[PDB]
């Protein structure tokens, strides 16, 4: 028991006096009523010196009765300093799964800790489904974690993050149609990347601007914006150019074919 208290509250000078009897690791790797080690308790409370000391003395990446690692507990609190210490010993830790299949990056996202998501996501964290068939991005979105979802969209890995979902789920859809349902100001932040300005001087005859539609195709995104009453995304220049294009492409042709076949009776009768 006593080292679990000393480690749980960062009491580094007590850990250096309990562990001074360094002849066996049986305490340093011990169990608990909840099956946590001293290294889990140090991580759980964010103690960046004690989590390092235990790793320096001889700690092991064992797991809770719930299957959680030290890095899961560090992520759950957003304690980037304790994560950075864990990853400096064993970056090979990062992919570990609990009883529900949550990788460490699921917790950093679900709890809304954006700088913790940035640390795991810039390292080689495995983007993977949990065993409720959700990605870390669905766990952010179903909890309205703006700064996590925005950090994922700003990050150099967004184009891997979007591709990873299970089509057969009734609960989890393509993430764009989750952002439109839960966090529309992130969808605004995403569509701002889709506007390119060529010449930085809008008065010039050589000026142009360009729109890219890859997030509005699978009209899945715009149906989701209508069903969620998103008037301020429907009015966004990328959506106006997407509809104007869709109308110029075939919508106008199909309408004028239909109206023309009627007008060809309407006018001759008068």
């Amino acid at each position: 028991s006593p080292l679990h208290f000393a480690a749980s509250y960062g009491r580094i000078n007590t850990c250096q006096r309990l562990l001074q009897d360094i002849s066996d690791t049986r305490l340093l790797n011990e169990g608990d009523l909840h099956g946590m080690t001293p290294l889990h308790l140090a991580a759980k409370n964010g103690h960046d010196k004690v989590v390092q000391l235990l790793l320096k003395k001889g700690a092991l990446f064992l797991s809770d009765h719930n299957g959680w690692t030290a890095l899961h507990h560090a992520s759950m609190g957003g304690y980037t300093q304790t994560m950075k210490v864990i990853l400096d010993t064993n970056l090979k830790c990062t992919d570990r799964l609990d009883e529900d299949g949550n990788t460490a990056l699921h917790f950093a996202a679900r709890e809304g800790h954006a700088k913790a998501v940035a640390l795991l996501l810039s390292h080689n964290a495995d983007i993977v489904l949990n065993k409720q068939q959700a990605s870390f991005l669905h766990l952010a979105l179903h909890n309205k974690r703006k700064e996590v979802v925005l950090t994922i969209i700003r990050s150099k890995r967004w184009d891997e993050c979007l591709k990873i979902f299970s089509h057969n789920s009734p609960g989890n859809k393509c993430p764009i149609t989750e952002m439109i349902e839960y966090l529309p100001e992130c969808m605004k932040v995403l569509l701002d990347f889709c506007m390119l300005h060529s010449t930085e001087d809008k008065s010039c005859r050589d000026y142009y601007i360009e729109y890219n539609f890859k997030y509005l195709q699978c009209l899945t995104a715009l149906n989701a914006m209508v069903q969620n009453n998103r008037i301020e995304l429907l009015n966004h220049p990328v959506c106006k150019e997407y509809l104007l294009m869709k109308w110029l492409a075939y919508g106008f042709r199909a309408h004028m074919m239909n109206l023309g076949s009627y007008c060809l009776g309407l006018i001759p009768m008068t």
């Binding site: 239909n258 109206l259 009627y262 009776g265 309407l266 009768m269 008068t270």
Partner: protein
């Protein structure tokens, strides 16, 4: 009601024009014309 007006137009715009093939009372031709000419324009709003 769009599906209903299209029957009133096409079943009556034929009668206004049946004299292209079959001679018909002048009164029935224009009584149909007054209905067909009306519903062609009323139903144009639904396009």
């Amino acid at each position: 009601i769009s599906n209903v007006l299209e029957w009133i137009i096409y079943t009556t715009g034929i009668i206004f024009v049946l004299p292209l093939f079959v001679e018909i009372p002048a009164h029935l031709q224009w009584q149909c014309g007054a209905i067909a000419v009306y519903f062609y324009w009323m139903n144009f709003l639904l396009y």
